[model samples]
Target: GMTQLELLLERIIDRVNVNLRHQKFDVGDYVRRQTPHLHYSKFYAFYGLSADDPVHFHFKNSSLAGSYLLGRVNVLHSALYKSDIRGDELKRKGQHFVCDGKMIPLHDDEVITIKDSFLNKTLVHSNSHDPESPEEFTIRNTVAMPYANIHGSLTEGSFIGSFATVDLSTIHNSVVRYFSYVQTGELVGKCVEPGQIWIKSGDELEFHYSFDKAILDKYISQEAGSCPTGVLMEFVEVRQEDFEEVFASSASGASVSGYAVIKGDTVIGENVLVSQRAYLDNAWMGKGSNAQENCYIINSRLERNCVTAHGGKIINAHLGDMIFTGFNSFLQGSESSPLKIGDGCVVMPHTIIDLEEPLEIPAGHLVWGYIRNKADLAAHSISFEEFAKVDGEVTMGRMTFRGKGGPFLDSFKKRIKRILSENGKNFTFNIIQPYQDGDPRGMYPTILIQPNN
Candidate 1:
């Protein structure tokens, strides 16, 4: 018999193995598939990526005075625009030189020379290039210089220009230009422009790359994949000339705020709310529909009363009436075959439904979990109205489902009414969501009677 610890380890290993085998493609490959127009070969030179293989380093060590600095030289020194003003006055004033977030006194002569022990290699590091690839790596300890540091794995074709700092992240086939600071633990495969700072935002491991050095007090977010860099950067504002037409009535009842970007031929219907930095490019929103915080609704259409929550991404997709997408839900379809959802559908939080080929979801469906292909979509999703009629209970889509006394469809209607009322009688659904979860108090269904006396 195995010990308790051994049993737990075995269970974890089994789960890990199963999950590893089930993963279909890498994120880099996914990006390549989505945008074939872009050349990622400059970044991803190595073809085969295996979890069991060791991480290959593509940088050469360059001699700097007595010690060596390991980094790719792309217009070094001149590009480190954010480099500290290290003058003799600071040294005379006894100002400590900050080295990798730690202070080293100017009087310390030992720091001028790099010790051989500084290049210590360890087996604890993991691969940042492709997370699903072999995660563990025998990594060389971070090498730091006067104005820059290399704390993450630099894969093949990746560039770390002179005077740039990289930390808690991996640079795979990407360029961290001079003077840029990367502080996020993300697998970066995009160009981090000069003077830009990349940092993690929110509790959901969402990364934000911005030119602004300081964190803004006001809420700031961008659409994924709409940035100059990849999905890990701020939304680059759309050009004003992109909009050929904007109806005066479009902004009448709709409350568009939070630096939302509406570009191209995007059409906004009556009482629609587009807020919280959501980007709309050639999209369409019907009455009572909303594109909420951090949502990227590009080339998509949402019918009446469709509400997309925070971080919801709807690209080249169509949704029918009364469709509510939970937080961080992603729905993308290809140009040839668009993904379409029927009436009264609910996409649960963190759900990813992608359709490269044409696919249509029937009415009254509750879709959760990952659905990449037609087979997976059919297997995972459930018909809510039909399946919720279990034992006369107001259930969603399960035989064991149970809820309070009310028709299943009626409950949804009441919920929509409550949501609309909470938005001050406007069709504005782009309300700020609470970070902390709360009880569903005052959410009970009640008949709204106006002037019934």
Candidate 2:
């Protein structure tokens, strides 16, 4: 519970500070690579918690990362004031973090020093406006650190108290670095933790992410050496009311967050988004994959960096790394034979690959109308037969757009157990997207944070 959260905070921060001063890691080099531009972006932290009645979202920001921090970090900054949160409508809403007594929109991207929403509001409220809720008052003297910073190979060091620091350097890295093992599927999707529950053989699904499994049986392969395939459909957006079954919490500490029909172990990975109008059955969704809409994959293994999207149909197939399958591309099988796509393969949109005959597409292939092996595309590449197979492979090519360099792939940081484990230090390294944005939080850009033992 960190019961021990307070003590744990102090201990880790002290340790990290010492480590930084000890010269174990390269602070400058880390800032450039790890946090990147976040070191330069403005950071902020707050001591208060947010809630939606009959609704629950830790207002302000809660888990959504990368370059868009500025665009979304203010999820809680709903044009309102903390003191007047529930006060008159006009009194309750407005913006904080202003510059020169004016809004930042009037000029350029305003970069201000880090601040805690609660800490500053409480102090300012006492002096100017009276706080109206327990949230504002309860937030006083307490730090709701992103249930927390930077680089520096804190090999034996652990510093995650605040959100600003010299080593990890930015809000982006700060938030990106802690506890990201588990993520829930979007609204109105089914999920089964510790195992499978709506997934049918050869069926389809959309907007569902079944991950953060409680248990993972030792890396079992569906076949001897065949890799899994991934299918991503067009996005099917869902609003709040769309959820027929959802866990909505309004109380102090409440959480509601799983999926599909089938049997056997279905091991899914982190960082995925499955939308509506699709199907995904008993299988393992490898790291960094998404099938938002109009996609289907039944009893398949979609490996890393493989995207099965745009109404693609994949049945009982194994897909390889960096494989991007476009729309309407089909790969199916009967009981006799199966299918497999190799590494760096691109299946252009609308390209129907409906062949059960050992359906294996070799690696590094650009599978437009005709599957070409060892294909690498650059500018003005893939001249079509003009209006001939144009809209066929053309529109498909545009829709089946995979990056030029190679297949698009992403990964999460690996976690290491506490090296300096002691009585109070008995903790695990949990990767999280904690929005660590306060200076008080040397915040280290809030990248890599380990929870206290």
Candidate 3:
């Protein structure tokens, strides 16, 4: 019998093989499949992807990074813009340096360097030319040197001027004393890793590269044969149980109640009810947990009995036991600092949480709106910049969190009270969910109270 951790790893591996795979398709080959070598527009007649879908088919490599627009998302936006600009045009138009919910445009010299005062992951993966590759192993240990900004000018050097390599560099005056360099080369790749660039206090990241589209055609390797930088690190995690002789079998990767693409070292424990259209990548869903419609969980972990409903997302986060996220809730796990949701917390619809540092809501806490202390507005909508920042953070399909939220009814008792006073409605009403026969979380929205009517 395998230990839980080992079994978990086995399952994680299983999920990876199913969805995530990497390849430099040189997708440009499809042009030959047409006349005038339209070079750009070929085979719309072949796979017949919907017009202006902002999507493409990656038939370039069948075993690796194959499939269409949904699969080829690993390329840089600079790469995506040039190759397919139809549906994605909405994204490339406005790129900015986001912080404190503030989006500073790429207008030259408009941004400031994050200081020693906090943890900065402002620019790591995408800016550094890394695709969100699938992971064969389960770990958040990836690091990179993020000197790459939209404007290519932000080079590394603190009060000092010369650049120092990761292996060779040391604490010159014990620099960025508040900061430290990470070692993820062992995990991702040797030449590059997450947090490879060391940016510290008083270092400025200027902007200029924001205007360019995802220029896929520019990458010679992805267009011709192989990327000089080596393969885009496509390693799928899977088991041999459904088991191949050449393949190793893990118990199971994830168990879904409906349709969803889960990949990269993720384990969906038994009794977990995954509702329709959830995309879980590089994460863990504990036993008895439920992920409702269109939930997107990437590079995160959900403990036992947690629930994510209505297209909610968990990116670069760790959700603890019994946590509940409703209706497009955004638990951003992608920040340099991991976001943690404690036991029994309730995150309301359309919540936006992007913190460079850990924002751990204590057990049973309720978070519902944009600002903690601010009023929850009726017409409030998540801003474009905010939505873009989040959408860009994921490992899968795009999600826009148009600011929306209602009451943060942390408990069933609170809900009943609100129904009578706050709602200004009748005492009795329809009571269905939680107790419904289809309830997965087995949520007991039991009305343990009588309306004050």
- Candidate number achieving the greatest TM-score relative to the actual structure: 1
Model 3, 94: alpha-carbon shift in Å? 53
lDDT per residue (tens digit) for residues 1-453 in model 3? 542222322332233222222311112221112212122122121111333332322221011111112211221101110111111111232355455576644432111121111111112111211112111001121111111111111112121101112211221111111011211121121122111222122122110101011221111012222221211111111211111221111224334632356578888786676643457778687866777544678898888777775436678888888777754354564556677777766665435565556556656555543422123211222232232233212211122121111211323225323322221101111212222222112212212221133
Question: What does candidate 2 score on TM?
Answer: 0.29
How far does residue 218 in candidate 2 sit from its true spot (Å)? Answer: 42
Candidate 2 regions exceeding 4 Å error are 1-264, 276-278, 369-453
The TM-score of predicted model 1 comes to 0.38
TM-score of 3: 0.30
* Candidate 1: C-alpha lDDT: 0.43
Candidate 1 C-alpha lDDT tens digits along 1-453: 542222322333233223223232111211112211111111111111223322122211111111111111111111111111111011222445454576544341111111111111111111122232222221221212222334333332344432345654654445554345565555345666554544442232222323332222111222222212222222222322222133112455888753577878999888888863467988898888877645678898888888886556788888999788754456778798789999988775445666667889888886764566788777567676555554333322211223322253344456556665554311211111111212311111111111223
In candidate 2, how many Å is residue 258 off? 4.7
Instruction: Rank candidates by lDDT, best first.
Output: 1, 3, 2
Segments in model 3 whose C-alpha atoms lie over 4 Å from true places: 1-254, 371-453
Worst 10 residues of 3 by lDDT: 77-86
Clashing pairs in 1: 43-173, 51-134
lDDT of 2 by residue, 1-453 (tens): 221212223433343334344323212211112231233223232221222111111333221221111110122211111111111111112333233464322121111111222111111111101112211211111111121111211112221221111121111111111111111111011112211111111112211112122211111111112221122111111211232132111212211122112224555565444433235666566665555333666778888656665345666778887567654455555446666778756565434343435556666554543221223122112322221222211224322321221112111101101110110001111122332443322122223211234
Compared with the true structure, all predictions reach lDDT values of 0.43, 0.29, 0.32
